[PDB]
Amino acid sequence: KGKPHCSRNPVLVRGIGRYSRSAMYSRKALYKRKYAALATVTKPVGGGTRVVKLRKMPRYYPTEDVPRKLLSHGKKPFSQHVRKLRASITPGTILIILTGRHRGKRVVFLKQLSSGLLLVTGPLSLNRVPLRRTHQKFVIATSTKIDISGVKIPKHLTDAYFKKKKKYEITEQRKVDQKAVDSQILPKIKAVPQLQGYLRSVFALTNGVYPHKLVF
Amino acid sequence: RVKENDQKKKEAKEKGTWVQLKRQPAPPREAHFVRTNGKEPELLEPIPYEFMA
């Protein structure tokens, strides 16, 4: 019985600790921490008491089984993967969603969600784009930012809030959340000159415009 | 070399020092110092051509 300390030596490089194991032996203080030395349930029957069996043996065996497979190690499921971002996508940046039905719309970034997706809302007043998820890869990042650091994005909306159910009818919670985030963002994009007209516009490549050449 | 190795193997057996008896190819020559004691090295020049024939 004890409270857990954190890991003493810092992550110097990935997989390499900053302190060697003698300095770590001294830091843990191991010099003074030496040490030396269901399947059955009885049930009454109205007979006697039977001893019933939990997980009784199977009644059907298929004509052939596959063998078990070996043990790999670094193969985590999706809900335990590490979630990256770019350095160019920061909360407040303006993005260009490229692929969906909102192609080319200049649209405001809110937060990195739990599944890695971008909570992304270029306002429903301007873009006609809701509180919507997008993907990091399928988004170009414009270097045009708002100081959104002082808004209260709600805690209840997360990756399970935007995941599909099964005619899609707009619930009232979508409207209330859209308003409660829209009214917090929209004065900060009105506080910048001509940013709302930039958000109403759509992105288009035109003649002599090459994406390797024009910077944003 | 048979006779000399018999002499070198009977000797240094009671003494116990291990003595090399196989021949060995000519090694790379070991590091050494070269003394330019006083004088500098003489500068060599390609000679110009002159047609003796």
Binding site: - | Q24, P25, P27, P28, R29, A31, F33
Partner: protein, 168 residues
């Protein structure tokens, strides 16, 4: 002036192919265990070895390798001739199981034995299968002439490290 010791160890890479080779050149190339193009071996130098490398100079490129070249060759292209089979050096138990009778029990013992050419260089080297190196990235200058006359054959002394890194 300090004249350093003449180098005891050479990495020999075969640069020319398998077609149209003289019988004495073919015999010496198969005594150095160079049976493909871009195969490599470590050779210790002495009067016998240097004349064997003189007799096959157009077909080999060789020089005097670095310590880092020994490190990358043993760690990345390092395989062992275990039970007359090419088995990858992925554990020190493999090196110990064959060469432990020479007190060579880890990868570092074998690297020390190859680089600082030891008493048991023959067995640590013959434990190593010939190195299977790729084509030189960037390329060759010219395969057919000597390094001195602007090519790649022959002794390129310290400069074999630029081509080990180019090939390994």
């Amino acid at each position: 002036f300090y004249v350093p010791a003449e180098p005891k160890l050479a990495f020999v890479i075969r640069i020319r192919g398998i077609n149209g080779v003289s019988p004495k050149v073919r015999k010496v190339l198969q005594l150095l265990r160079l049976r493909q193009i871009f195969n490599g071996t470590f050779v210790k130098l002495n009067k016998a070895s240097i004349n064997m490398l003189r007799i096959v100079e157009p077909y080999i490129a060789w020089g005097y390798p670095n310590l880092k070249s020994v490190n990358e060759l043993i760690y990345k292209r390092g395989y062992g001739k275990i039970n007359k089979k090419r088995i990858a050096l992925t554990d020190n138990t493999l090196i110990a199981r064959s060469l432990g009778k020479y007190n060579i029990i880890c990868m570092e013992d074998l690297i020390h034995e190859i680089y600082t050419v030891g008493k048991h260089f023959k067995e640590a080297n013959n434990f190593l299968w010939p190195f299977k190196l790729s084509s030189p990235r960037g390329g060759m200058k010219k395969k057919t002439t000597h390094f001195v006359e602007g090519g790649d054959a022959g002794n390129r002394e310290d400069q074999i490290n630029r081509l080990i890194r180019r090939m390994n």
